[PDB]
Design a protein around this ligand. Structure first.
Ligand SMILES: *[C@](O)(CO)[C@@H]1CCCN1C(=O)[C@@H]1CC[C@H](C(C)(C)C)N1C(=O)CCCc1ccccc1
Length: 710
């Protein structure tokens, strides 16, 4: 099968660094420079062997045609009301980017409000963040080019969709919050830096500042309202309280779900907003999360994890602020994770819990916390919601493994609350009734029970004959919940596959104790959990090692790359998307410093000792056994991925191809594809999504020699 040669790639054998006494060689360090002729030539040589490999077999075309056909269905957001008008996002099916629509009534004719598709030929300019003024008459929105985290904020007057001159540059990881006087908006920006700021650079992002922009002015007049020059990693995000009286500042450092909470009573400002605000440091440490829900005068309701790993709701009175005085409004549940909360219709709270990786939605009274109404849902996820304090109705969107999504509406003025199907769409071609979802709980190495979802065609023999696609992430308190994937269901229907998603430690499925179980010294639990998931599928007869594919993105790309290294005999195929591969240097680039809360940092001897043991870049080793090789491996990245700089995948594939690729016994291909005008994934246009999944399943099909089933 291996009918190509790996490119020649220079090894700088002088690149030796000391880490607390451990000499580490980094011969591909030079790939850290994206702009060098040498790096650009490496990328070209790699894509030159990958693309033909992927496009040789007729199955890529079959898959791409079936994907294009089945992905072609109406895709809606929830309606949301802003001032006098309703808005919703809608894609007719195959538009590169969804379009924002407006209508003046829920029953009236909608018209295009903002259409990103016209800002590029190829859909690579995307919306990234927006905020309407409190009255709904003005609109701010962020645009990113080529998948970069960098944003430009532009502005419109809603009536007539009129473009305004205001443009805010150097926006990244930013809040967007209008003061209720309609005068201007808070946002975040980074100081100027040498070299490029377009998504191709690797330069670290530090000293993020909080600014206020007055509408109708140039950015250079913007007011600096908060900054932390002694704490270059601190990021201060602003929001206004529901009554418009207070600015709330959530200062983060790293990805841990914790924040300082400062406030500014805007009425107490000496002459409106003219400089650094008179911040009151309500919570001035990083011990807990405080997520603003609503207030009633000085009584502020927050979702918190303080003393509550599964989260709870507390009331802090600004006039009696000590911790011992706080009221517990809705206590922590013993198992169920309180994911998010919203206040609607003045005195209702909407609460969304995660119960064994499935969502429930409940309505509660604001005054007492008492449960009032359960909104009935099938097994799956709530992935969209609208309804804020002033609103008298909610919309919410539900999805699962086997159904695209239903949007419900519920009129909260009604004595009897009966939610109703507002929009529902049928993907004809994949009959949901042909398949089943099961959830099982398997023991990991240390005996911890891990959930796993398995989706498969009804009445299959568990004889180990099926190809399988096992997905994980495992990190950053993120829960991996049921979602509708056309691309995955084709694998099932047309490649006879079994799909699995393992809810490994590191994620948020069981609150902070679950997150804490997959970070720092205990990161290895994630990899152990994920290996055990594979072994469960094998032992139980869903698949065999030779037919098993694993997949993960970002922190999940780390997960699958590490698993490739640690248990190469367990997997036939590995697809690592935009993965963190160099665990010794991740912190040096763009926003990487923020991930040390999950990973630790190599500057510390203790942390270095954890990291060296699983860092994919540092653990490529020919398997000792003669009969064991590395799985077929495909790394996917893109030249504007400034979330996870592509040097991670570049150095890793260079190492895979040298250490393992050159051995006689290695016949499984080790490839990388580096896309252009794309980044980490968010905002990727439909055309690129389709190319991507076609590439991935074609790789699987060729490596495992899977027949297409029409
Ligand atoms: C991928 O796993 C996921 O895209 C990469 C690689 C490691 C972590 N990671 C992220 O993107 C992290 C995971 C949490 C967070 C969000 C945006 C997905 C919630 N990540 C960030 O990098 C956010 C960066 C900006 C930031 C920093 C601190 C606090 C808030 C936002």
């Amino acid at each position: 099968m291996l009918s190509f040669q790996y490119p020649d790639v220079y090894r700088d054998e002088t690149a030796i660094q000391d880490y607390h006494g451990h000499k580490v060689c980094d011969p591909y360090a030079w790939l850290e420079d994206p702009d060098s002729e040498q790096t650009k030539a490496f990328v070209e040589a790699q894509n030159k062997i990958t693309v033909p490999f992927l496009e040789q077999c007729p199955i890529r075309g079959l898959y791409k045609e079936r994907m294009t056909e089945l992905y072609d269905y109406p895709k809606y957001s929830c309606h949301f009301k802003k001032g006098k008008r309703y808005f919703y996002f809608y894609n007719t099916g195959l538009q590169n980017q969804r379009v924002l629509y407006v209508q003046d009534s829920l029953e009236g004719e909608a018209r295009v409000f903002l259409d990103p598709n016209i800002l590029s030929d190829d859909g690579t300019v995307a919306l990234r963040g927006y905020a309407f003024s409190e009255d709904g008459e003005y609109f701010a929105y962020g645009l990113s080019a080529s998948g970069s985290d960098w944003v430009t904020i532009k502005f419109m007057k809603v009536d007539g969709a009129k473009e305004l001159p205001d443009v805010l540059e150097r926006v990244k990881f930013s809040c967007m919050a209008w003061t209720h006087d309609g005068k201007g908006m808070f946002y975040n920006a980074y100081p100027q830096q040498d070299g490029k700021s377009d998504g191709t650079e690797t330069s670290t992002n530090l000293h993020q500042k909080l600014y206020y922009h007055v509408l109708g002015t140039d950015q250079s007049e913007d007011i600096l309202c908060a900054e932390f020059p002694d704490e270059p990693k601190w990021m201060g995000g602003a929001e206004l309280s529901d009554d418009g009286r207070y600015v709330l500042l959530s200062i983060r450092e790293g990805c841990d779900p914790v924040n300082r909470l400062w406030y500014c009573d805007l009425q107490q400002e000496s002459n409106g907003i003219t400089g650094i605000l008179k911040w009151v440091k309500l919570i001035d440490n990083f011990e807990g999360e405080y997520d603003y829900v609503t207030n009633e005068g000085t009584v502020f309701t927050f979702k918190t994890n303080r003393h509550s790993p599964n989260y709870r709701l507390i009331n802090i009175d600004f006039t009696d602020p000590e911790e011992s005085k706080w009221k517990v409004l809705v206590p922590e549940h013993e198992k169920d994770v309180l994911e998010w909360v919203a206040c609607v219709r003045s005195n209702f709270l909407v609460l969304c819990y995660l119960h064994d990786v499935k969502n429930t939605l409940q309505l509660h009274d604001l005054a007492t916390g008492a449960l009032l109404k359960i909104f009935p849902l099938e097994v799956g996820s709530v992935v969209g919601y609208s309804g804020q304090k002033k609103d008298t109705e909610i919309f919410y969107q539900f999805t699962s493994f086997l159904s695209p999504g239903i949007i419900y509406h519920c009129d909260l003025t009604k004595e009897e609350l009966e939610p109703r199907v507002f929009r529902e769409v049928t993907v004809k071609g994949i009959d949901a009734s042909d398949y089943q979802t099961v959830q099982i709980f398997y023991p990991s190495k240390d005996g911890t029970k891990i959930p796993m979802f398995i989706v498969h065609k009804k009445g299959i023999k568990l004889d180990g004959s099926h190809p399988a696609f096992l997905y994980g992430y495992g990190g950053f308190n993120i829960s991996i919940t049921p979602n509708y994937s056309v691309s995955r269901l084709i694998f099932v229907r047309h490649m006879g596959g079994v799909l699995a998603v393992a809810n490994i430690r590191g994620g948020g499925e069981y609150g902070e104790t679950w997150h804490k179980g997959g970070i720092l010294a205990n990161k290895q639990n994630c990899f152990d959990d994920f290996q055990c998931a594979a072994e469960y599928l094998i032992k139980e007869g869903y698949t065999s090692p030779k037919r098993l594919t694993i997949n993960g993105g970002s922190n999940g790309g780390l997960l699958v790359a590490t698993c490739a290294n640690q248990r190469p005999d367990l997997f036939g195929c590995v697809i690592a998307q935009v993965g963190v591969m160099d665990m010794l240097k991740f912190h040096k680039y763009t926003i990487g410093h923020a991930w040390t809360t999950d990973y630790g940092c190599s500057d510390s001897k203790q942390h270095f000792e954890w990291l060296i043991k699983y860092s994919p870049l540092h653990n490529v080793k020919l398997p000792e056994a003669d009969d064991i090789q590395y799985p077929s491996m495909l790394l996917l990245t893109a030249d504007h991925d400034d979330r996870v700089v592509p040097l991670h995948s570049l150095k890793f594939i260079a190492t895979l191809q040298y250490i393992v690729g050159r051995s006689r016994k290695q016949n499984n291909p080790l490839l990388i594809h580096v896309d252009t005008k794309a980044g980490h994934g968010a905002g990727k246009p439909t055309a690129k999504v389709i190319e991507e999944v076609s590439d991935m399943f074609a790789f699987i099909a060729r490596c495992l020699n899977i027949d297409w089933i029409p």
